[PDB]
Design a protein around this ligand. Structure first.
Ligand SMILES: CCCCCCCCCCCCCCCCCC(=O)OC[C@H](COP(=O)([O-])OCC(O)COP(=O)([O-])OC[C@@H](COC(=O)CCCCCCCCCCCCCCCCC)OC(=O)CCCCCCCCCCCCCCCCC)OC(=O)CCCCCCCCCCCCCCCCC
Ligand SMILES: CCCCCCCCCCCCCCCCCC(=O)OC[C@H](COP(=O)([O-])OCC[N+](C)(C)C)OC(=O)CCCCCCCCCCCCCCCCC
Ligand SMILES: CCCCCCCCCCCCCCCCCC(=O)OC[C@H](COP(=O)([O-])OCC[N+](C)(C)C)OC(=O)CCCCCCCCCCCCCCCCC
Ligand SMILES: CCCCCCCCCCCCCCCCCC(=O)OC[C@H](COP(=O)([O-])OCC[N+](C)(C)C)OC(=O)CCCCCCCCCCCCCCCCC
Ligand SMILES: CCCCCCCCCCCCCCCCC[C@@H](O)O[C@H](CO[C@H](O)CCCCCCCCCCCCCCC)COP(=O)(O)OCC[N+](C)(C)C
Ligand SMILES: CCCCCCCCCCCCCCCCC[C@@H](O)O[C@H](CO[C@H](O)CCCCCCCCCCCCCCC)COP(=O)(O)OCC[N+](C)(C)C
Ligand SMILES: CCCCCCCCCCCCCCCCC[C@@H](O)O[C@H](CO[C@H](O)CCCCCCCCCCCCCCC)COP(=O)(O)OCC[N+](C)(C)C
Ligand SMILES: CCCCCCCC/C=C/CCCCCCCC(=O)OC[C@H](COP(=O)(O)OCCN)OC(=O)CCCCCCC/C=C/CCCCCCCC
Ligand SMILES: CCCCCCCC/C=C/CCCCCCCC(=O)OC[C@H](COP(=O)(O)OCCN)OC(=O)CCCCCCC/C=C/CCCCCCCC
Ligand SMILES: CCCCCCCC/C=C\CCCCCCCC(=O)OC[C@H](COP(=O)(O)OCCN)OC(=O)CCCCCCC/C=C/CCCCCCCC
Ligand SMILES: CCCCCCCC/C=C\CCCCCCCC(=O)OC[C@H](COP(=O)(O)OCCN)OC(=O)CCCCCCC/C=C\CCCCCCCC
Ligand code: SF4
Lengths: 156, 83, 105, 318, 98, 174, 115, 70, 71
């Protein structure tokens, strides 16, 4: 159909820009944040993929929860996630952000950032290598490609 | 001149920007009064014909006022042509 | 009150800017240079009282040149009469006023 | 036809802004031993398009405490003045041949100062307020220095017309004539355009995006476009003012090519400086111009007043 | 007299009325004071340009110079008042009584 | 005709009405900047390009300092806008209605105010037919500040130097 | 005419871009989304409180120096006069007075920010 | 290598060529194949108006000469 | 030459305006056609409206703003 074809091509166009223009928030906790820095380093340059760090959550599309989320920090992480405008995606990195990590049975650690914010991608490791995080970012990009928002709207 | 030389040496080591600024200002104030081309600039500005050269009525006793632009009488810009 | 230092010393501090008929750069004339010259020459050396009483014609011409009140009144009256005439179709503007002519170079 | 001319001036400028974004990314990458965008398209040529589409398809938000009337006006003013700065530039024929082709630039720059001020104040945020006051101080400093420097350089020219600048620079270059004023003018243009080392209003390390902290999606992209358009426009102004290209009336394409090459060289120098140097501190910037540039600028202004008079080389009025 | 002069004189009158009617801020009264001289500048240059008073074109520049001198004076007094009282309110300038 | 200068004069008066109603120093500065730009346009139409651009630049520079001073010394918890306060809105509406009455009456008939007499006709008609050549009369008159006007330069420079000394002395404190 | 037309064109393009930005994408705004940003925690006070200006004197001096540059701008036309000696003398007089003002302020520490 | 920066610079240069070349072409097109007349002063504006009047087609760029005087 | 052409054009426009005024103001009770405003008989330059008063808006606008608006 003409309408279905138009909405499919338009959805592919929209998903391409979001897929190829990821702007993660400058946000790191604990040891896992160093692997983000090595990913940004020349060896595994994230900028060549369209992945550019931005400081303001308003101008950010992806939150990389990289490191341990504590009880004293959870309100701030939730606040910045809320202040980040839609569409927004979440990549948790490392065992601490995935589940509890080395500090699962701790009185002051949140056993998983998904108790606070909806997580789109989980990157396993302690810390995951820069290659592993780059693979996670590419997997997030492929996940973005499969979104069909205009196709859902047209058939709604 | 030793005290002046010491002051200049210290200022050059401490405030070269101020030393250069004061030297440039002093040159800008002193030099125009000595250059022989200031009068040339004055004459060039005077020789620019912004408005029309209204002619004068000839009463028969104007030997130095030309009757035609190409007559020998009148101002000459030969000095300006080769400059 | 008015210590005429300029006239006592032969100086010239603001008399150049006092009037628009004075020496202007590049001999640029004022809008009402002739009218101001006539009024000034009429009023020179007779005092304020006599200047107001007797040079009133020159002063009125100067003010008319400056402000253009009577001229604008005449133009407005002509415009109103023409508009009234063309409202009823009595007056047909000529082609040289309607834009169908070849003006002078 | 004039509307077609306006569109031909506008749209290629925005395209050049987007590809300047790409060029800065790649230049910084290769100066930092990276590659820069090379995945989105062939050599990353579709990266600006992807970023623009993402920004204009993302949701913009208005802060709860923000003054919405001035929140919306600021990007409009910034982009409008960034596009308006390009109308009197001769390449080699200006779109609008203003008799005073420089005072218009100064006035429009001073008006474009208020875009960041109103965006920061309307945001009703502390970092935005700090960025706004940094903008105030920076504007003070670079405004006075730019005014005096431009006065001197155009005093060497004869009038405030950029085509007259071309005619003046027909034989040699204002860079040769007045290189100290040229260096100080380059620093002043950096400060005016808020580029490193003077990116104080949007200092990422010290403030979280500065005045545009609350701006997202389309309105933020408008600030970015205005910034890059101002960068290119000021580099073009510097190229016209100090690096005068030869003009052939019958084939004016050569002047356009030379002008574009000089503008690109100056813009790449801007990116080079940003990569090379750290960031200033705004009080140190204020003390840099007032205590170092301003005295030497006054001295050079006196020198350039006296020089044509003492050498009988006063330029023609027309 | 054309209507442009009418509008400029009306603008000056509005600015003068604004100065004479304070609300809370000394800064707003300073802004009204700056508007009066803006209207004066516009009126003076409109009169001078129309009548081709060539040597009078330097008067508006001097007008602007002394306008901003007055603005500087007002800002200095305002910063002193603010340092004294914590706010630029004109209600705090009541120690002296007529 | 096109009434361009008249429309700009109306906008000038509107901006004056705004910053005289005085909502807050921020919006007063905004209105003053608008008024300065529109006055620059008016005098550009009348002939003085240098004077228009000069006044616009001067007021753009002046309102920059006023913004910094109102952020520091003339701000409150809830800054007032025109519709925020009853008095500000009342003054703004009163000014707008007075300007509307003046313009409407002047357009309908030759309005003779209690102060001055204004004639309803063309600002284009009030102009002059004569013209200069190869120089701007405004530019030459302004540049005559140095050839002529030696006294004005002296008094202005002394006034500026004394102003610097004065602002140093007033804010000394203690 | 042309300048008004191009100003209108630029303003219209900017306004159209704003309209596209604020009406094309999907909007989902709640209280926490639009809250002020203070690096993840709630602001302690209000951003509308007075914010100290440590360079207040420099701003006033900037006003006066803006007047100075306004006076100095018509110099290129002033160099075309016959009275070159008088023009040069008065221009240097103005510049020397500006330099003296700067020197006085610098020596009396008007350029130093408040502590 | 470093030469992969060139295509972006080339595209930016091509984009910057368009304004000046387009303005020159439009000036030539709308002024009868000649440069747009520059009237910085009332004298030059009066020259343009006289050119419009003498042309007889209300276009200043239409120039008449000896064949027009005789 | 330009001075002579300007004089002839000004006089011609004045005469055309005078003839049109005579045609229009033919029923006004008290109205003298071509009456001067100034007391003096000295020649006075028509301001802008004595020449381009009864003419088309295009010509009026060109005469009054053509130079300033030309860019
Ligand atoms: C050269 C320019 C000449 C212009 C004209 C002459 C100007 C002379 C000088 C100024 C004199 C005063 C003139 C304005 C009078 C305004 C009257 C009024 O009610 O003001 C208070 C009203 C309150 O605004 P606010 O305090 O930010 O919002 C508080 C509301 O309670 C919040 O309530 P809310 O959130 O429930 O309501 C939201 C609504 C509220 O919007 C408004 O209330 C604004 C309505 C008037 C807009 C200006 C006209 O806003 C929106 O929906 C946002 C989009 C609409 C506004 C977009 C920007 C203005 C477009 C025009 O508006 C203003 O304060 C206006 C400030 C700006 C002055 C006018 C600037 C015009 C610029 C036009 C060109 C734009 C591009 C430039 C590049
Ligand atoms: C009816 C229109 C209303 C418009 C309202 C908004 C704009 C107000 C300003 C006036 C209109 C624009 C300028 C018209 C100029 C007309 C004369 C002309 O064309 O001159 C040719 C001249 C040509 O230059 P010239 O004067 O050097 O040369 C003379 C002409 N020749 C070349 C023949 C010798 O144009 C200029 O000089 C350009 C000057 C531009 C000045 C712009 C001022 C206004 C800027 C914005 C003000 C508002 C800021 C708001 C901030 C945000 C608020 C929320
Ligand atoms: C370099 C350019 C710079 C400037 C760029 C300016 C923007 C350009 C954007 C172009 C593409 C836009 C595509 C639509 C984007 C929709 C965004 C959105 O929120 O979608 C989700 C929404 C989802 O709606 P929904 O129905 O699911 O909403 C319910 C949502 N919940 C449940 C969360 C409450 O989709 C829509 O609303 C439908 C939008 C339909 C399309 C609208 C018009 C687009 C026209 C584009 C040009 C078409 C050209 C002709 C066809 C060509 C075909 C090859
Ligand atoms: C050409 C002029 C344009 C003016 C501005 C119009 C808005 C669009 C601006 C350009 C960008 C377009 C982007 C793509 C499309 C999205 C925007 C759009 O079209 O939104 C339409 C809006 C969209 O609604 P929305 O709120 O869902 O918009 C978001 C859209 N998506 C989902 C894609 C993110 O739809 C309508 O307005 C439909 C109703 C039309 C009729 C009512 C209009 C409002 C009320 C006015 C009348 C009130 C009184 C009623 C009685 C009258 C008689 C007395
Ligand atoms: C002004 C209004 C907005 C303008 C928008 C239109 C102008 C831009 C047109 C679109 C820009 C180019 C889009 C196509 C990009 C092709 C790049 C290519 O590499 O993508 C491939 C194909 O692209 C996408 O897969 C298909 C979607 C993009 C094209 C959508 C169809 C055309 C939509 C309509 C275009 C014209 C717009 C008309 C309406 C405005 C697959 O890439 P991908 O797999 O991910 O990368 C994996 C990583 N690799 C490379 C290392 C392996
Ligand atoms: C303490 C209370 C009293 C203080 C008094 C202080 C007075 C300050 C000193 C100034 C006094 C007057 C100086 C001269 C003013 C201008 C006089 C001018 O008219 O003279 C001209 C000569 O000009 C001068 O020679 C130029 C240099 C004058 C000196 C300038 C630098 C020195 C200024 C000192 C000021 C010090 C600051 C104030 C200290 C309090 C020639 O006369 P003029 O008929 O028109 O020539 C026609 C030119 N036209 C055709 C273009 C019109
Ligand atoms: C050198 C002179 C340039 C002057 C003009 C400058 C503007 C043009 C910019 C060109 C950038 C380089 C484009 C590289 C060619 C890529 C070819 C292809 O990949 O892209 C197509 C077209 O790309 C762009 O649309 C070219 C036009 C650029 C649109 C610019 C509009 C917005 C400009 C804002 C910046 C769309 O792809 P599509 O087939 O559909 O999707 C399927 C992809 N497949 C085939 C690989 C599977
Ligand atoms: C137009 C194209 C040319 C562009 C030029 C670009 C140059 C290369 C790029 C450099 C990177 C620029 C980014 C760096 C910004 C900071 C620059 C900077 O710091 O310079 C300021 C620095 C002062 O800072 P500090 O030393 O820390 O403080 C001094 C404390 N007492 O120096 C300056 O002030 C520069 C001003 C002097 C330069 C002018 C040279 C003067 C030489 C005078 C001789 C010529 C006299 C003229 C004629 C005399 C009669 C014949
Ligand atoms: C010249 C203007 C003043 C005229 C007389 C007015 C007197 C009353 C008004 C006073 C305001 C004038 C203030 C300006 C001078 C005061 C500045 C001052 O006190 O110090 C000057 C300052 C001190 O530096 P330091 O002591 O080393 O700093 C130590 C820091 N730890 O040094 C200076 O002299 C700088 C002054 C530079 C410009 C001075 C202007 C006067 C120069 C005139 C030269 C031209 C004369 C013309 C003759 C032409 C001959 C052909
Ligand atoms: C001419 C051919 C011969 C060439 C050689 C001639 C060169 C010599 C000419 C005279 C040199 C002048 C030397 C005076 C400069 C030194 C003064 C000095 O050192 O002041 C110290 C002190 C150090 O600064 P600080 O604030 O303490 O830094 C922070 C420290 N923590 O500086 C000051 O206090 C400021 C002094 C006043 C500044 C004046 C600047 C404004 C005037 C310059 C504008 C241009 C010159 C004006 C016209 C000059 C001619 C009248
Ligand atoms: C053409 C007329 C354009 C005006 C449309 C009115 C738009 C409006 O009312 O405000 C919307 C929007 C902000 O409202 P929000 O509270 O943030 O979210 C609303 C999302 N629908 O305002 C705008 O888009 C700005 C108006 C565009 C520029 C107006 C001209 C200047
Ligand atoms: S998962 Fe491991 S490397 Fe990452 S933050 Fe936890 S302890 Fe550190």
């Amino acid at each position: 159909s003409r309408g279905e074809y138009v909405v499919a091509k338009l959805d592919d166009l929209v998903n391409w820009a979001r897929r190829s223009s990821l702007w993660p928030m400058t946000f790191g906790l604990a040891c896992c944040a160093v692997e983000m820095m090595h990913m940004a380093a020349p060896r595994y340059d994230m900028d060549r993929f369209g992945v550019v760090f931005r400081a303001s959550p308003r101008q950010s599309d992806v939150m990389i929860v990289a490191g341990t989320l504590t009880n004293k920090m959870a309100p701030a992480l939730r606040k910045v996630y809320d202040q980040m405008p839609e569409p927004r995606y979440v990549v948790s990195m490392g065992s601490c952000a995935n589940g509890g990590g080395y500090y699962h049975y701790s009185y002051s650690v949140v056993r998983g950032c998904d108790r606070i914010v909806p997580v789109d991608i989980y990157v396993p490791g302690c810390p995951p290598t820069a290659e592993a995080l780059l693979y996670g970012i590419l997997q997030l990009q492929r996940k973005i490609k499969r979104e069909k928002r205009l196709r859902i709207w047209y058939r709604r | 001149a030793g005290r002046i030389a010491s002051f200049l040496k210290n200022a050059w080591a401490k405030e070269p920007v101020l030393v250069a600024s004061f030297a440039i200002g002093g040159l800008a104030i002193i030099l125009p009064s000595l250059s022989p081309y200031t009068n040339y600039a004055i004459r060039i500005n005077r020789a620019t014909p912004y408005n029309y050269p209204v002619p004068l009525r000839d009463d028969g006793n104007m030997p130095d006022v030309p009757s035609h632009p190409q007559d020998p009488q009148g101002p000459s810009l030969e000095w300006l042509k080769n400059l | 009150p008015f210590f005429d230092v300029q006239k006592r010393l032969g100086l010239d501090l603001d008399r150049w800017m006092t009037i628009q008929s004075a020496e202007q750069p590049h001999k640029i004339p004022g809008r009402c240079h002739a009218f101001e010259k006539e009024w000034i020459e009429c009023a020179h050396g007779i005092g304020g009282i006599r200047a107001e009483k007797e040079c009133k014609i020159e002063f009125d011409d100067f003010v008319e040149c400056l402000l253009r009140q009577k001229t604008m009144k005449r133009l407005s009256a002509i415009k109103r009469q023409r508009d009234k005439l063309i409202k009823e179709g009595k007056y047909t503007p000529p082609p040289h006023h309607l834009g169908k002519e070849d003006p002078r170079p | 036809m004039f509307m077609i001319n306006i569109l031909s001036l506008i749209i290629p400028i925005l395209l050049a802004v987007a590809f300047l974004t790409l060029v800065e990314r790649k230049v910084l990458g290769y100066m930092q031993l990276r590659k820069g965008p090379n995945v989105v398209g062939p050599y990353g040529l579709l990266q600006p398009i992807a970023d623009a589409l993402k920004l204009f398809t993302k949701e913009p938000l208005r802060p709860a405490t923000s003054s919405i009337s001035m929140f919306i006006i600021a990007p409009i003013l910034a982009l409008s003045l960034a596009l308006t700065m390009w109308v009197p530039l001769p390449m080699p024929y200006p779109l609008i041949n203003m008799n005073l082709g420089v005072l218009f630039m100064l006035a429009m720059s001073s008006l474009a100062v208020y875009s960041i001020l109103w965006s920061g104040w309307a945001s009703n945020s502390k970092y935005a307020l700090i960025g706004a006051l940094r903008a105030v101080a920076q504007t003070i400093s670079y405004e006075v220095t730019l005014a005096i420097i431009l006065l001197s350089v155009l005093l060497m020219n004869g009038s405030y017309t950029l085509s007259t600048l071309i005619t003046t620079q027909e034989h040699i270059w204002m860079i040769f004539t007045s290189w100290p004023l040229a260096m100080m003018w380059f620093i002043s243009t950096l400060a005016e355009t808020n580029r490193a080392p003077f990116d104080l209003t949007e200092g990422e390390s010290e403030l979280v995006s500065g005045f545009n902290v609350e701006y997202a999606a389309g309105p933020f992209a408008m600030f970015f476009m205005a910034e890059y358009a101002n960068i290119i426009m000021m580099n073009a102004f510097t190229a016209i003012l100090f690096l005068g290209a030869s003009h052939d009336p019958h084939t004016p394409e050569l002047y356009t090519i030379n002008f574009v090459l000089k503008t690109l060289a100056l813009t790449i120098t801007f990116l080079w400086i940003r990569a090379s140097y750290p960031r200033f501190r705004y009080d140190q910037l204020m003390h840099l111009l007032w205590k170092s540039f301003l005295p030497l600028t006054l001295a050079l202004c006196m020198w350039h007043i006296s020089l044509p008079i003492m050498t009988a080389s006063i330029p023609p009025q027309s | 007299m054309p209507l442009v002069y009418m509008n400029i004189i009306m603008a000056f009158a509005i600015a003068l009325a604004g100065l004479l009617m304070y609300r809370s801020h000394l800064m707003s009264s300073l802004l009204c004071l700056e508007g009066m001289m803006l209207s004066l500048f516009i009126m003076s240059t409109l009169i001078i340009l129309n009548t081709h008073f060539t040597l009078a074109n330097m008067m508006p520049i001097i007008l602007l110079v002394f306008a901003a001198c007055e603005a500087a004076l007002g800002l200095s007094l305002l910063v002193m008042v603010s340092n004294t009282y914590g706010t630029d309110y004109v209600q705090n300038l009541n120690l002296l009584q007529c | 005709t096109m009434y361009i200068a008249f429309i700009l004069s109306t906008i000038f008066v509107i901006g004056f009405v705004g910053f005289s109603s005085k909502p807050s120093p921020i919006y007063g500065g905004l209105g003053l900047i608008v008024s300065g730009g529109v006055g620059c346009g008016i005098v550009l139409n009348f002939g003085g390009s240098f004077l228009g651009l000069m006044v616009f630049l001067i007021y753009l520079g002046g309102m920059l300092v006023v913004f910094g001073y109102t952020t520091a010394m003339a701000t409150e918890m809830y800054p007032e806008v025109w519709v925020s306060n009853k008095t500000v809105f009342g003054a703004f509406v009163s000014g707008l209605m007075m300007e509307f009455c003046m313009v409407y009456y002047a357009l309908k008939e030759e309005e003779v105010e209690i102060i001055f007499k204004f004639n309803g006709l063309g600002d284009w008609v009030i102009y002059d037919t004569g013209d200069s050549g190869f120089f701007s009369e405004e530019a030459m008159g302004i540049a005559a500040l140095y050839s002529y006007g030696t006294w004005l330069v002296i008094v202005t420079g002394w006034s500026l130097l004394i102003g610097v000394v004065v602002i140093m002395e007033i804010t000394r404190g203690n | 005419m042309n300048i008004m037309l191009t100003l209108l064109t630029n303003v219209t393009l900017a306004s159209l871009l704003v309209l596209i930005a604020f009406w094309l994408p999907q909007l989902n705004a709640y209280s926490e989304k639009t809250s002020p940003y203070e690096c993840g925690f709630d602001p302690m006070g209000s951003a509308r409180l007075p914010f100290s200006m440590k360079f207040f004197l420099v701003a006033i001096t900037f006003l006066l120096f803006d007047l100075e540059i306004a006076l100095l701008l018509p110099l290129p036309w002033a160099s075309q006069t016959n009275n070159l000696k008088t023009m040069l003398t008065m221009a240097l007089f103005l510049l020397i007075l500006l330099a003296a003002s700067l020197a006085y302020e610098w020596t009396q520490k008007g350029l130093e920010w408040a502590e | 290598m470093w030469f992969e920066i060139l295509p972006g610079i080339a595209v930016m240069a091509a984009c910057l060529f368009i304004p000046g070349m387009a303005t020159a072409h439009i000036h030539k097109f709308t002024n009868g194949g000649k440069e747009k007349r520059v009237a910085h002063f009332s004298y030059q504006w009066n020259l343009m108006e006289r050119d419009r009047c003498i042309s007889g087609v209300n276009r200043y760029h239409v120039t008449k000469g000896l064949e027009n005087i005789d | 030459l330009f001075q002579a052409e300007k004089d002839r054009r000004v006089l011609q426009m004045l005469r055309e305006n005078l003839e049109e005024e005579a045609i229009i103001m033919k029923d006004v009770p008290d109205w003298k056609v071509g009456e001067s405003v100034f007391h003096t008989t000295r020649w006075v330059t028509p301001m802008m409206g004595e020449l381009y008063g009864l003419r088309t808006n295009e010509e009026i606008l060109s005469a009054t703003y053509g130079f300033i608006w030309y860019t």
